C-alpha cells in the first residue's frame, strides 16, 4: 500500500526544484509552448534530473494521463537493444486518446524517459538514433546520464542538453530536516550532517538511508551507528587501524587487521574507497601516492571482476606497507 520516500516528496510540478535557475526556465518556456524537444539531462546522481523530467511530464499532461503517456526504460537490458527497440516501437505504435478537464488538451507526442543512457555502446547508440529519427514528430525522447561525453555525436547534437550541478550540503541538510519534521522522526543536526557526508552528496541515497533507518529503528532516535551500518561506510577507527598496521611494517598484525575487517562483514570495495580517499588527501609523497593508487585501481578491478576479498585486501595492504616502510 504505501510508497517509498524518494518518490513521495519529489516536486509535483516545475519551478519547485531549488538551486536550478536556467534549466527550469527553459523547461517552463518549452512547456508554455506545449512542445518539449528531445531532452538530455546530464549530472551527478541525486541532483534532480529525474525529478525535473517527471515534474515536466506531470505539468504538461494530466495526472490521470501522466503514467499512460510516459514510459520509463533503462538502457542496461541484458538482451541487447532488440528488446528496448521493440518496447519503444510498441509504445509509439499504441496511441491513447486523452482529455483534460483543466482546459488544455494533451499534446500528441509521447514521452520515453530513458535512464543510464551513458552505458550504451556506439552500435546501440546509432540504433537508438535511427529509432528516434523514425519517431521524430510522434515521440520526444529523454536521455538521463552523468557524463555527456559518452554519448556519441548524432544523438548529442540533436538533443537539448542541460547540466545539473549537484546541490550543496546546506540545501540537502535543510531538505532532510524538512523530511524529518514531515515524517515525525526525532532527529539531531549531527545525524543529518553525517547522513549527508556518507551519502557523498547524493540526495537519493540520503533519503533512502533515512527511510531505512527510521523503519529499522522505529519510534527511536537516529544515531550514527545505525546510519554507519546502513550506508555501509567503514568506521574511521578501522581505517586508522589499517593505516597504523601498514605503517608498523609487521605482516602479522596486518593479517590480524584484515581478518578483523573481513570477519566483521565489511565490504572490500568500501574499504578500498575509504583507503583511496584517505591516501590521496594526505602528506605522502607523489611516488608513494602513485604506486598506492595504481595498486588500488588493480585491486578494485579484481574486486569488480570477482576475486577473493581477503587476498585482494592482503595484497593491497602489503603494497601500502612496503611503500610506507620503504622510506623508513
Amino acid at each position: 500500500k504505501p510508497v517509498p520516500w524518494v518518490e513521495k516528496y519529489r516536486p509535483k510540478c516545475v519551478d519547485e526544484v531549488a538551486f536550478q535557475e536556467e534549466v527550469v526556465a527553459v523547461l517552463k518556456k518549452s512547456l508554455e509552448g506545449a512542445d518539449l524537444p528531445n531532452l538530455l539531462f546530464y549530472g551527478p546522481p541525486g541532483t534532480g534530473k529525474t525529478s525535473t523530467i517527471l515534474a515536466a511530464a506531470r505539468e504538461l499532461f494530466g495526472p490521470e494521463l501522466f503514467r499512460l503517456r510516459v514510459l520509463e526504460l533503462n538502457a542496461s537490458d541484458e538482451r541487447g537493444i532488440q528488446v528496448v527497440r521493440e518496447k519503444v516501437k510498441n509504445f509509439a505504435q499504441l496511441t491513447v486518446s486523452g482529455s483534460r478537464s483543466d482546459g488544455k488538451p494533451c499534446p500528441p507526442f509521447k514521452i520515453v524517459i530513458l535512464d543510464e543512457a551513458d552505458s550504451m555502446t556506439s552500435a546501440a547508440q546509432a540504433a537508438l538514433r535511427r529509432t528516434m529519427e523514425k519517431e521524430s514528430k510522434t515521440t520526444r525522447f529523454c536521455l538521463i546520464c552523468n557524463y555527456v561525453s559518452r554519448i556519441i555525436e548524432p544523438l548529442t547534437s540533436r538533443c537539448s542538453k542541460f547540466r545539473f550541478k549537484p546541490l550543496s550540503d546546506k540545501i540537502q541538510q535543510q531538505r532532510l530536516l524538512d523530511i524529518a519534521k514531515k515524517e515525525n522522526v526525532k532527529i539531531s543536526d549531527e545525524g543529518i550532517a553525517y547522513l549527508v557526508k556518507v551519502s557523498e552528496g547524493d540526495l537519493r541515497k540520503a533519503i533512502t538511508f533515512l527511510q531505512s533507518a527510521t523503519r529499522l529503528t522505529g519510534g527511536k532516535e537516529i544515531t550514527e551507528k545505525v546510519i554507519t551500518d546502513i550506508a555501509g561506510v567503514i568506521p574511521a577507527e578501522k581505517i586508522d587501524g589499517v593505516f597504523a598496521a601498514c605503517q608498523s611494517g609487521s605482516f602479522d598484525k596486518l593479517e590480524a587487521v584484515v581478518k578483523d575487517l573481513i570477519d566483521e562483514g565489511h565490504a572490500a570495495t568500501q574499504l578500498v574507497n575509504q583507503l583511496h580517499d584517505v591516501v590521496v588527501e594526505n602528506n605522502l609523497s607523489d611516488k608513494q601516492k602513485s604506486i598506492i593508487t595504481e595498486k588500488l585501481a588493480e585491486v578494485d578491478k579484481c574486486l569488480a571482476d570477482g576475486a577473493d576479498e581477503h587476498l585482494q585486501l592482503i595484497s593491497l595492504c602489503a603494497t601500502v606497507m612496503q611503500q610506507l616502510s620503504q622510506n623508513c
Partner: protein
C-alpha cells in the same frame, strides 16, 4: 519545426575553470607536426613463400600411397596365437566363451557392424553384468507368468512375488540398453513393440493403437514372431512394450506421460522404458523397477573390439583401442562404427610388432580418429614429431594445426601428456658438484614454472573457442551437470560471435605451441650439461623424473591428466549422502560441503575406530540415534580415509 536544442549549462561567473586557456608551458606548445608519409607498396612486391609455407621444391611420390591391401585369411594356428596373446593381455576375460559366437556371427556385405555383430543373447553382452541378469530374471518371471496364464486358460476350457510391471533402464549412450532388451527378448522369445522418438507418439495415438497389445493376446503365435513392429502413424510369443528414449518429449507428443502412466496402471504385459537422461528417474511419478547400466570396463570392451578386429582377420594391440575408448568415453556404438570405417578402409600403418605374451600390427587408430593423419606424413609419428626440435615452417604449421584440431574440443593436448612429451625420464609410481646439480634442477624448475605461467595466461587472458561453464558451473561441482540437450524445434536465435572462435583457436594454439617449444628447448639445453654432472659422480635424475599413475601409461596419449572415475565416485558420494531427508535443506552450498562433509567423515571414522575396539554394540547407533538416515555403503565409504 527544427527548434533550438540549446546546450544549457549553469555557468556561474568564477570558479576559474569554466573559461580556460591553453597552457603557457613549453611542453604542451611544442606540438610535433603529424606525418602521413608511409612506405610505398608498389615498389615492393610480395615474394613467394613470405606469408605462407610456399617452397620452390615440391614433394612427389611420397604421398598418394594407395593401399590395395588384400588381407589373407588367418589360419587356425595364427588365430590361436592371437587368442592367447589377448588372453595374456587380459587375464580376467573369458575369451573362450565368445569366439565361437563371433565366428558364427561372421559366417559384398550390406550390414553395419553394429547389426552384423548384434548380440542375440544377453550372455553375449559385455559389461553391466548385474543389470542384464536383473533384466533377464525379470523377463523370465514374466514368461513364467504368461505360461501360467496359458496353463490356467487351458485348464479352464502379488506382494510376495513383487512383480512390478515395468523396468526403467538408465545409463550412458551406447552402452547397450536396447541391445540388452533385444537380446533378452530374442533369447526368451518375446515380441517387442517399439515406440521411438522418430515416430509421432501422442497420447491418443499411442493408447488407441497400442492398448490392446497389452490387454489381449497375439493372433499370430507360431512362426514369424521374432520381428519388431516399430509403432508409427502417418513356442508362443508374449507381447512386450518398449519405449525408446522416453525423456524426449516434443510439443507434438501431447500427453505422452499420462498415456504411459495409463499403460502403467492397466497393463497385463511387460513394459520397458529406455532413457539416457538420469533426471527422468526423478521427474516420472510411478512404480517401476530401476535398472542402471554403468560405464563398462575399458579393458573388457577393448578386448572385445580387438576381437571384432581378429574375426575380420586383422591383428592389433590393446593400447590403441584403450585410448580409442577413452576418446569416445567407452561408447561401444561409436567405437564399433569407427572401427568398421577404419578396418574397411584397408588399415593405416603396416608396422610389425613381434609379441609372444605372424602378421603385421595395425596400430594408429586413435591418430586417424582425431584426424592427425591428415596433418602429418604417413612416415611421421605423433610423439616422434613432438619430441624432436621443430625448426622448419611446415613443421610449425603441422604443430599449429594439431593444436588447433585439439583446441576446438576444449582439450589441452600438450598439458595432459606433459610428462610423456618433455625430454625427461618418466617412471611409474610403485660441494660445487652438488651446487651445479641444484642449479640444473633450478633451471628445469624455472622453465616448467615459466611454461605453466604461460598456460595460466592462456586460460585466463585468452578467449576460449567454446564458452566454458555455459550451462553448469566449472568442473567438480554437485549443483547440477545433467544438462540434457534441447527438446524444442524452435531455433536458437542467439547473437553469439563467430570470428572470435576460430581467431581465438589459432591464437591459443600458436601461443601454447610457442610456450611448449620454449620450455622443451630450455629443458634440453639444461640437460645437455647433465653429462658433466654424471662425470662428476652426482646423478640428480631421481629429482628430475616424473611420477605418473599406471592408468595413464596404458594409453598412447590422454585427453585429461586426472582420473575421472575418482571424480565420479566422489560426486556420487556427495550426491548420495546429501540426498538424505534431514540434510536436504542445507541451502548454503559451499558452507554445506566444507562444513558438513569433513565432520561427517570424522564421525564415520571415529565410529569405525570404536567398532574395531570390540566395544558395545550401541556405539553403532549414533547415526540411527539422531534420525540421520544415511545408507550403510556411503557410511563405509566415508569411514575409510581422506585421499
Amino acid at each position: 519545426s527544427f527548434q533550438r536544442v540549446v546546450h544549457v549549462q549553469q555557468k556561474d561567473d568564477g570558479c576559474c575553470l569554466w573559461h580556460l586557456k591553453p597552457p603557457s608551458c613549453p611542453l604542451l606548445t611544442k606540438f610535433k607536426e603529424l606525418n602521413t608519409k608511409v612506405i610505398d607498396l608498389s615498389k615492393c612486391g610480395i615474394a613467394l613463400g613470405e606469408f605462407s609455407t610456399l617452397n620452390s621444391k615440391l614433394k612427389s611420390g611420397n604421398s598418394a600411397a594407395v593401399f590395395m591391401r588384400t588381407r589373407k585369411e588367418f589360419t587356425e594356428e595364427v588365430r590361436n596365437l592371437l587368442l592367447e596373446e589377448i588372453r595374456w593381455s587380459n587375464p580376467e576375460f573369458s575369451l573362450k566363451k565368445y569366439f565361437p559366437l563371433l565366428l558364427k556371427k561372421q559366417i559384398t556385405e550390406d550390414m553395419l557392424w553394429t547389426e552384423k555383430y548384434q548380440p542375440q543373447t544377453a550372455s553375449e553382452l559385455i559389461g553391466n553384468e548385474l543389470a542384464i541378469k536383473k533384466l533377464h530374471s525379470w523377463l523370465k518371471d514374466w514368461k513364467r507368468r504368461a505360461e501360467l496364464e496359458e496353463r490356467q486358460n487351458l485348464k479352464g476350457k502379488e506382494e510376495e512375488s513383487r512383480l512390478c510391471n515395468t523396468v526403467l533402464i538408465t545409463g550412458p549412450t551406447g552402452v547397450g540398453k536396447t541391445a540388452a532388451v533385444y537380446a533378452c527378448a530374442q533369447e526368451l522369445g518375446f515380441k517387442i513393440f517399439e515406440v521411438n522418438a522418430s515416430s509421432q507418439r501422442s497420447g491418443r495415438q499411442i493408447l488407441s493403437q497400442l492398448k490392446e497389445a497389452t490387454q489381449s493376446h497375439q493372433v499370430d503365435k507360431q512362426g514369424v514372431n521374432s520381428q519388431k513392429p516399430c509403432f508409427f502413424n502417418s513356442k508362443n510369443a508374449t507381447s512386450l512394450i518398449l519405449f525408446e528414449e522416453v525423456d524426449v518429449i516434443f510439443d507434438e507428443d501431447a500427453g505422452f506421460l499420462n498415456a504411459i502412466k495409463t499403460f502403467m496402471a492397466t497393463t497385463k504385459r511387460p513394459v520397458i522404458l529406455t532413457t539416457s537422461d538420469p533426471t527422468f528417474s526423478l521427474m516420472f511419478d510411478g512404480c517401476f523397477e530401476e535398472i542402471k547400466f554403468s560405464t563398462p570396463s575399458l579393458l573388457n570392451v577393448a578386448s572385445y573390439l580387438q576381437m571384432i578386429c581378429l574375426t575380420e582377420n586383422f591383428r592389433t594391440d590393446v593400447k590403441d583401442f584403450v585410448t580409442l575408448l577413452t576418446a569416445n568415453t567407452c561408447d561401444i556404438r561409436k567405437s564399433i562404427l569407427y572401427l568398421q570405417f577404419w578396418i574397411r578402409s584397408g588399415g593405416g600403418v603396416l608396422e610389425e610388432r613381434p609379441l609372444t605374451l605372424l602378421p603385421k600390427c595395425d596400430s594408429g587408430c586413435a591418430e586417424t580418429l582425431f584426424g592427425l593423419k591428415n596433418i602429418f606424413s604417413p612416415s611421421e609419428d605423433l610423439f616422434s614429431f613432438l619430441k624432436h626440435k621443430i625448426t622448419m615452417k611446415e613443421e610449425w604449421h603441422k604443430f599449429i594445426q594439431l593444436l588447433t584440431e585439439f583446441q576446438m574440443r576444449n582439450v589441452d593436448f600438450l598439458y595432459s601428456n606433459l610428462e610423456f612429451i618433455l625430454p625427461l625420464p618418466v617412471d611409474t609410481i610403485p660441494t660445487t658438484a652438488g651446487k651445479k646439480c641444484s642449479a640444473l634442477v633450478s633451471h628445469c624448475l624455472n622453465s616448467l614454472s615459466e611454461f605453466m605461467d604461460n598456460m595460466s595466461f592462456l586460460d585466463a587472458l585468452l578467449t576460449d573457442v567454446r564458452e566454458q561453464n555455459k550451462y553448469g558451473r566449472n568442473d567438480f561441482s554437485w549443483t547440477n551437470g545433467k544438462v540434457t540437450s534441447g527438446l524444442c524445434d524452435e531455433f536458437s536465435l542467439e547473437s553469439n560471435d563467430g570470428w572470435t572462435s576460430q581467431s581465438s583457436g589459432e591464437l591459443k594454439a600458436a601461443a601454447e605451441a610457442l610456450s611448449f617449444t620454449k620450455c622443451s628447448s630450455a629443458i634440453s639445453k639444461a640437460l645437455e650439461t647433465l653429462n658433466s654432472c654424471k662425470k662428476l659422480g652426482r646423478d640428480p635424475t631421481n629429482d628430475l623424473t616424473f611420477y605418473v599413475s599406471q592408468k595413464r601409461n596404458n594409453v598412447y596419449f590422454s585427453q585429461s591428466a586426472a582420473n575421472l572415475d575418482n571424480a565420479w565416485k566422489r560426486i556420487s558420494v556427495i550426491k548420495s549422502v546429501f540426498s538424505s531427508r534431514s540434510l536436504l535443506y542445507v541451502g548454503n552450498r559451499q558452507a554445506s560441503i566444507i562444513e558438513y562433509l569433513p565432520t561427517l567423515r570424522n564421525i564415520c571414522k571415529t565410529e569405525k575406530l570404536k567398532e574395531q575396539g570390540k566395544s558395545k554394540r550401541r556405539f553403532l547407533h549414533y547415526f540411527e540415534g539422531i534420525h540421520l538416515d544415511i545408507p550403510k555403503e556411503t557410511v563405509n565409504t566415508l569411514a575409510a580415509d581422506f585421499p
